Design a protein around this ligand. Sequence first.
Ligand SMILES: CC(=O)Nc1nnc(S(N)(=O)=O)s1
Ligand SMILES: [Zn+2]
Length: 259
Amino acid sequence: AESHWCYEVQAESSNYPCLVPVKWGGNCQKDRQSPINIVTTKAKVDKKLGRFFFSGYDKKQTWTVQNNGHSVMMLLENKASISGGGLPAPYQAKQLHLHWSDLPYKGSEHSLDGEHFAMEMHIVHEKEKGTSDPEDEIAVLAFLVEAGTQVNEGFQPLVEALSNIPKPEMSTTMAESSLLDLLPKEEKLRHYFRYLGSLTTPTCDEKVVWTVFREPIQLHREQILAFSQKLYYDKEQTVSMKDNVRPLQQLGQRTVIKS
Ligand SMILES: CC(=O)Nc1nnc(S(N)(=O)=O)s1
Ligand SMILES: [Zn+2]
């Protein structure tokens, strides 16, 4: 490529040339890409999609959180894992990160029935393989975030940490907190959508089994704004981190199923 990959907002907000999403390389131009719009009434029920088992999600830890230049990322270091959820194996948690905007009607990568949410949180896990790379090497759990007036206390350790990592490659330690602190109530997580796709940043490898939960996380408008107010794409701090969102891709001949 002739320059570093970026999101559209970065190219629009700076005179420094970068490669916008439609121009991304790697596998980004192949035909099983993510994110997608989900028509919820067209997704077929698959009874084999049962409940998830979240392991290590309840435990209070002091997570390392970092600005990687295109998101904020918690390092999960195999300290959590998942099974069930119609998955073919257990998966080890690697990192958690987010995509957002600063307007309530956009910020998520996926849309449900043409509606974008204020943020989307991705928990990235790796497959525990056997002897028999695969289409489902990575399991990403996607949670949509709806802006409101409810202060989400569970999110405060993360939101407070943001002031400490404004620039790329900066890391800090979050106050004691659990992954469940960040999620909707567990019982609400029985309803989710499932399809096979890609990572949503270069090289956009087609190795992700996606889960998009129906239940949104409720976050106060100003907790969401704290992301774009405190974070930057560059050490120069010329472009606030927001609209770190890949445009919608075509489902093509794929099928979306639901629990
Ligand atoms: C470092 C790493 O895990 N790569 C990721 N790239 N895109 C991802 S996402 N947005 O689809 O969850 S994760
Ligand atoms: Zn992501």
